[PDB]
Amino acid sequence: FVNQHLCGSHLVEALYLVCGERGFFYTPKA
Amino acid sequence: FVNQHLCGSHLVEALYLVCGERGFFYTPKA
Amino acid sequence: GIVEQCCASVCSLYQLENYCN
Amino acid sequence: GIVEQCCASVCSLYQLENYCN
Numbered sequence: 737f738v739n740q741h742l743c744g745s746h747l748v749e750a751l752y753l754v755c756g757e758r759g760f761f762y763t764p765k766a
Numbered sequence: 767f768v769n770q771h772l773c774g775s776h777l778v779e780a781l782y783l784v785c786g787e788r789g790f791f792y793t794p795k796a
Numbered sequence: 797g798i799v800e801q802c803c804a805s806v807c808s809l810y811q812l813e814n815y816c817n
Numbered sequence: 818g819i820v821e822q823c824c825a826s827v828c829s830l831y832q833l834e835n836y837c838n
Contacts, residue, residue, distance in 0.1 A: 738833055743824035745782055750823075752778045752792070754830065755837035759792040762782070762836070763817060766789075766818045768812055773803035780802075784809065785816035792815070793838060796797045 742750050751760040772780050781790040801811050822832050 738828055738830045740827060741824060742828045743820075745779065747819065747823055747828075748778055748782045749775065750828070750833060751836060752775055754833050757794060758837040759794045759796075760836050760838060761791045761817075762789040763818055764787060764789045764820045765817070768807055768809045770806060771803060772807045773799075777798065777802055777807075780807070780812060781815060784812050788816040790815050790817060791838075793797055794799045795838070 738750055738754065748762055751762060754760075768780055768784065778792055781792060784790075798811075798815060801807065819832075819836060822828065
């Protein structure tokens with residue numbers, strides 16, 4: 737699921753699954 | 767969609783929609 | 797944090813927006 | 818940033834994990 741183009745909710749969903757209890761930051765402007 | 771219990775992917779999904787181009791931080795340990 | 801406020805309890809827009817960049 | 822690396826181009830685990838807390 738990670739090694740593809742991931743946009744919008746798809747990207748957010750990959751971050752959620754990978755990062756787990758760490759959480760993550762989603763900075764699309766940065 | 768916001769004024770309810772939001773957990774896991776559901777929460778992440780609400781942040782994504784509300785925050786839009788700003789993005790967000792998801793810090794479940796903090 | 798967000799889990800206590802939005803998962804264990806009912807979320808709000810006001811609170812959700814505190815986590816936007 | 819993440820969009821250029823993972824949306825406009827093919828993502829990676831290595832890169833995705835740079836955005837974990």
